[PDB]
Amino acid sequence: PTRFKKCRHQRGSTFCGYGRVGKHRKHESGRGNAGGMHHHRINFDKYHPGYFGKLGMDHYHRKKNPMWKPTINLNNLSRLIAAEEAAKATKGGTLPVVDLQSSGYAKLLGNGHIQVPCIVKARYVSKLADKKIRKAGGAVVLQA
Amino acid sequence: SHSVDLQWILVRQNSRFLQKRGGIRMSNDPFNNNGNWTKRHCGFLNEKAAVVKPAKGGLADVSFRRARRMACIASRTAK
Amino acid sequence: NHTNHNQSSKNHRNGIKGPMPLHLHNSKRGSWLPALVNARRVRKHNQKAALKKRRERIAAFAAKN
Amino acid sequence: KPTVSKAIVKKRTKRFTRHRYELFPQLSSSWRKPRGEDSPVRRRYKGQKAMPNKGYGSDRATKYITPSGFRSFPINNVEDLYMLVMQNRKYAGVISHTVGARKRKAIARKAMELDVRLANGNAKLR
Amino acid sequence: PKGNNAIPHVHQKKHWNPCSSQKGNVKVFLNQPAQKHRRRRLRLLKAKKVFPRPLKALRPQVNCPTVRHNMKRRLGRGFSPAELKAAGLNPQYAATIGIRVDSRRKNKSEEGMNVNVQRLKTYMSKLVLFPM
Amino acid sequence: DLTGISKKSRVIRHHTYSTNPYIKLLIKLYKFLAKRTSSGFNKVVYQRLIKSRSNRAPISLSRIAVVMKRKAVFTAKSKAAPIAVVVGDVLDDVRMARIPAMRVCALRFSKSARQSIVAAGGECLTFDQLAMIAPTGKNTYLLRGRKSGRESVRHFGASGVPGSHSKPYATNRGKETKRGRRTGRSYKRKAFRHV
Amino acid sequence: RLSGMNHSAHSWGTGRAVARIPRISGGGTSTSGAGAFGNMCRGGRMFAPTKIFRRWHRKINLHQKRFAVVSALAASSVPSLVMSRGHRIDNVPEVPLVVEDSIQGYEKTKEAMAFLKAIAAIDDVNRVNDSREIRAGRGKMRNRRYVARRGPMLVMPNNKGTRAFRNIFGLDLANVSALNLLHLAPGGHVGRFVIWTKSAFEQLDKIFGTFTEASAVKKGFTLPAPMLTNTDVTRIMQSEEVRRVLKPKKL
RNA sequence: AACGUGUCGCGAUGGAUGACUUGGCUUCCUAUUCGUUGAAGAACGCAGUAAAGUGCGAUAAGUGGUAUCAAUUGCAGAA
RNA sequence: UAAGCCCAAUUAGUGAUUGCCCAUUAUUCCUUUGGUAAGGGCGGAAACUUGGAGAAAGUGUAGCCCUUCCGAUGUAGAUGUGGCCUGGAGGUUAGGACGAAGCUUAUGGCGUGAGCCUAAGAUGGACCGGCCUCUAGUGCAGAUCUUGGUUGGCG
RNA sequence: UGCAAGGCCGGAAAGAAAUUAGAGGCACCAAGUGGGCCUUCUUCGGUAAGCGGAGCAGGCGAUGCGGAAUGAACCGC
RNA sequence: UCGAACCACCUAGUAGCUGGUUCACAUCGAAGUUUCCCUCAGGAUAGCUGGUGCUAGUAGAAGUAUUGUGCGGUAAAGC
RNA sequence: UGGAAAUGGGGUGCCCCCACCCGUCUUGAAACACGGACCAAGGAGUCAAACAGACGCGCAAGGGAGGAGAUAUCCAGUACUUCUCUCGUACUGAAAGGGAGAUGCAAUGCAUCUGUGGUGUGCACACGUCAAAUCCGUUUGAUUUGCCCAACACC
RNA sequence: AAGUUUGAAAAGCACUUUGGAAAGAGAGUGAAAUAGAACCUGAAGUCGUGACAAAGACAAUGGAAGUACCUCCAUUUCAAC
Ligand SMILES: [Mg+2]
Ligand SMILES: [Mg+2]
Ligand SMILES: [Mg+2]
Ligand SMILES: [Mg+2]
Ligand SMILES: [Mg+2]
Ligand SMILES: [Mg+2]
Ligand SMILES: [Mg+2]
Ligand SMILES: [Mg+2]
Ligand SMILES: [Mg+2]
Ligand SMILES: [Mg+2]
Ligand SMILES: [Mg+2]
Ligand SMILES: [Mg+2]
Ligand SMILES: [Mg+2]
Ligand SMILES: [Mg+2]
Ligand SMILES: [Mg+2]
Ligand SMILES: [Mg+2]
Ligand SMILES: [Mg+2]
Ligand SMILES: [Mg+2]
Ligand SMILES: [Mg+2]
Ligand SMILES: [Mg+2]
Ligand SMILES: [Mg+2]
Ligand SMILES: [Mg+2]
Ligand SMILES: [Mg+2]
Predict the structure, then answer these.
(1) What is the Cα–Cα distance from A51 to A40, expressed in whole angstroms?
(2) Is the preceding peptide bond at C19 cis, omega within 30 degrees of 0?
(3) Taking every annotated instance into account, which residue ranges of this chain make up the domain Ribosomal eL28/Mak16 (chain B) (predicted)?
(4) Which terminus of chain E has fewer CB atoms gathered within 10 Å of its CB, N or C?
(5) Partner F contacted by G60 (CB < 8 A)
(6) What letter would DSSP give residue F87?
(7) How far is it, in rounded angstroms, from Cα A12 to Cα F90?
(8) Nucleic strand I under 7 Å from the C-beta of D124
(9) Considering only CA atoms, which of G116, G195, G198, G200 is closest in space to residue G158?
């Protein structure tokens, strides 16, 4: 939409909102991010505090697949057991059998108290996670 | 599941009838009992009654001052 | 060209906002430790008391209702 | 067919023309506000021509009232007359200068038969 | 001015605009609806040409490699010499009756070929191969 | 007539910029009620409707449960269950397995929040259906729902100012943690400062 | 992409009593020393020469394309919304109209006309061919010479009987399988008196679902929840229970 | 008074505007890519009457083949 | 023997006030407009003649209707407008050889204005208006602007 | 033990610092501006200035109206 | 055309510099100062200002006085 | 007045008295500062991307695709789509890596819901208060929603 | 640069006579020649002559406020408010 613009709204204003003293120029405060340490240093040091440095060691060939560890908490396990799959979790005394990596979620983090007793099968599991489940009628199982 | 006060929020701005000609906001309504474009005078939306000699009906009887003229039209013009 | 003119009248347009009262940002922090390490432990007990005082309430308010 | 009563006094009659409008056969008799920094009109000297204020607004009770009472309403065909006939005291039709002659007679016939005043007519019959 | 904006990093400094001087280096997909129709028209027209053969060949299940995907199964190209030998078919003759052959896969786990060796003899069951 | 009273005018949001035809019905409902009644509720529930969409923060059923459990612990224990009104909309909470039979009145519900209520034993209402039950809003527990912790509100600030735990606008999360955000890069943004 | 820039001109310099713009170079020709490739000048480059990598096509969330088609059919069952928005349904026997699916059987159209009199929906069909006029204003020189109204569309379950109805002017032919907004609500106005062959309501419960079940085809799509069920917000502001707690007046 | 104004009617110049649009531009698509067997290019030519252009090459505004039917058209001429 | 200067005066030592003239100030009166400023109605009744305490549940208008308070200048700038306008699209309503666009104006009117509508053309000859959305190559007096044309100086 | 101290606390407490009480508090986004000048009061530098540099407030800029014949600034407003 | 020719192209070269930047009304409405900058014809940052607000707000109000209670070393004075 | 006046308009001229050429840079423009014969048509914040804020809408611990296919249809559109990806529900460390419920007994164990206090809508509570009558303005307890401040715990 | 885009049709002004012939005046064509090939519309600008307030210059213009006279412009009354 071009009618929904202010230099179309402010025809006849003679400056489209850029003033008479300081005339709208082309690039006049540097061009780009220029001057981050010279004349825009007060902007960078103050809205971008950590910019302009080096830190840590270099990981040359970084592959995000071997460094892939999605996480789910204990209070979010119910997100993987349908009410029908939990309808068998009511009868027969059969604990739910949750398998994380099929839904994503390599690692199992222990946050909150687990609402429903189940047995999760996760590649990775926290110490407090490994302990809340095994003391809530459940069991963590390590896979892969 | 759709009442008349919702059938008026949808049409308040546009219709076959709204006939905004200048700033007048008349209406070619069935219920021309006032010719306005208000939420109470248009029987196309509601179950309301228009004002002609048959007086077709679907209160709000501004038909009083709307049928007196309707008959006096033909009288004062039959020549 | 230093002027200071119009500045006192600029500071009084949107007003020279009064200071925040003491119950704002009264973080007794960075202050002298042996005080705040005691004004800490007494907060822990006074919270165990605040939690306990609500425990009888509800339980008194249940049976006595 | 007769109007309804009003108080039709008007604030200003001389139109607001732009400034230096006569000195140039190019400018228009159509108010554009002078954006000039030191124009005498914008900074409102004495013998300068005025600038449209909110202060010139007509009385709302008599705003849009044609000198014959009868606030105006454009009419294109005889069926739009019936849509006006209920306000034939408050509104008056105005045929639209593109309605040809064959249809303009079919209207001015119906108006008198409806007492719906038209701002247009008086061809050996008003 | 600037202020509390994300440092832009826009990467449009290499004459991509097809201006009056530069030929431009932009790829606009104004033809993808024509191409979707174009391919499905070849596809549906290649299918009645190859008929009664299936348009797509047979591809095996293979395990997507990394730890992110290792639990996801996928259709790889060709089977192996192994599944074909463990199902009878000569990989020279499998590659001519719709079965797709891959002389590079290594059958690292017997688990793997077992899903595919048996997957052949499903095809080799429901295939007529009427002679010429 | 010198005043000084030029900036004391507050922006109240007279109307709504919403175009939803089912909330302009609730607004005309709650101008009638908010105007021609002595109800403190109807006043308050009317400014919250004309309020914008970013300001009507959603309350999860968790928040609704817990605060309705903090009401229902001090009642006549047989008096009534007040109606949890939220002028935003209700979202399910997979961190609350068991939900009480509480009546709720929201402009909207998640498809998983409506079923979680109705499965629990409560009935989720509307506002054309609450104007029939306590239109004055007797026995109704009006609720906002947290709008802090919102990712917009925690960029608000500078992030390079001492005592500013705001998040810089940076797509690359591992871009700006260098000089200025390190104690060993000639200055570290002072994590605390009395204000 | 090189229009209006096709000359090889350079400003003469701020030393000659003319403007400072690139001026055509040469002689004999009338363009010699004329203004070159600016907004101002003839054969002069446009401002912001339009580009084909403009954003021509929009995404729309599926749930908004469905819940726009949903709320466009809801209006096709509200005869007040159809009388407004311009469809002549004064003596239509019912809205939403439904017709016994003996219509994929019409194979000539002299009878498919005699159908539209059986419903008096030939009124909305004659307002479409009476309103056939040359377009106004450079639509006519383009390929949009004529303009009609949108007429009552006949929604089919299949594509069988489109033969008797293809040539009638007006009377859109739609398919239940793919309800098409911009036809079910053209000009952005909900309305469009529709005809709904009998075999076309069969699927609407199936292809859209109910307020409590997902559809057969729009998968995971259930009808939304009405923000207020007693949509008659006025008939409760004049209710007995509200008047009891109103605030009394005094004058 | 004359001249100079100035408003109006009528004229002249001017060629805007509108209306039209066998052109442009843009987008997409279906197939096949010149030359030593002398190409592309340009040169000169050719019509009853032809300057340009289009077409053609001393078989020259076209010859042949098929396939169509009675014109071409400024006006000769011509089954 | 001031119409100068310095002091006073203000209807003349008779009895206690404003000698007198000028403003975009003040007071008061109308009218606009904003405040979302307060209210009251927010569908049918009577004061001698009509208007409204019967015009619709409403940001915004030709305001839903009244009436009440208060403010009202302004460059850069910001913002709003049921706000103005040009080209085109999707809708709707509608004109046109019984004369459309255009064009002319001592053609009025009406809007504060942008502008709109009308009439009348010894104009024009075939297209096009209103409204809701959409859209943009959308508003020009001024750039030693660009192009075309004319003109003065000037017979 | 109890004083005193901190974080608290309930029982209890009222005024026999004027005025306006023209509503407090934050928050977000974004311009424009970043050449000022004059002036009152005082005062640094200079022979001096319609000078340069300051402090204070007011102005002009950005603003007319009224009158000092005349004047960006003075006097009223 | 020469203290670096001419043509075409890169190229619409860059310009903190100069000129211009097209409707109305309404609602408000400033700044030439702070600090930093090879900075002083420009920026960035605060202040000024607008819009949108959120919020229980006669209060955490005040370019004001009073009352108490501190502070100071200029005028005058005194050598 | 009875069929041409009377008003309103607008055209012209005149009287009175008001009024300094516009745009522009600038603290300051009538300037002896700059640009300015006239008119016509052109003529200047635009598109793309990446962001953020606001606002509109959808769904919401999920949201959404894209590419592609699939197969019904004039249809470059509309309709459908598992699959995947994407953003995020979890943060942190330079890295190896690690990874947040609360309460009571304990210094891990067992029942396993705002975490604390404070400032704090609305409603229910009783509390009286000129109060037409008794519904509401006053208020005090209860829970306090959002928000904020303080300091717990935990990663 | 340049749409000759006259008109539906060239029906493209025969012919008379003024002119040395052009051109003009007449006719005539056609719905229009006030569509006559430098042709649809035909604007602004500037100019011409006719009229006028026939005014009246002592810069133009403009502002407010009147008045003079003149305006098929609107409205209203035209046995009445
Ligand atoms: Mg600047
Ligand atoms: Mg400057
Ligand atoms: Mg394994
Ligand atoms: Mg006027
Ligand atoms: Mg959070
Ligand atoms: Mg060009
Ligand atoms: Mg070029
Ligand atoms: Mg047009
Ligand atoms: Mg043209
Ligand atoms: Mg080749
Ligand atoms: Mg040869
Ligand atoms: Mg040739
Ligand atoms: Mg265009
Ligand atoms: Mg139309
Ligand atoms: Mg342009
Ligand atoms: Mg122009
Ligand atoms: Mg000029
Ligand atoms: Mg002054
Ligand atoms: Mg003097
Ligand atoms: Mg001394
Ligand atoms: Mg400058
Ligand atoms: Mg100067
Ligand atoms: Mg509390």
Answers:
(1) 12
(2) no
(3) 6-71
(4) C
(5) no
(6) S
(7) 49
(8) no
(9) G200
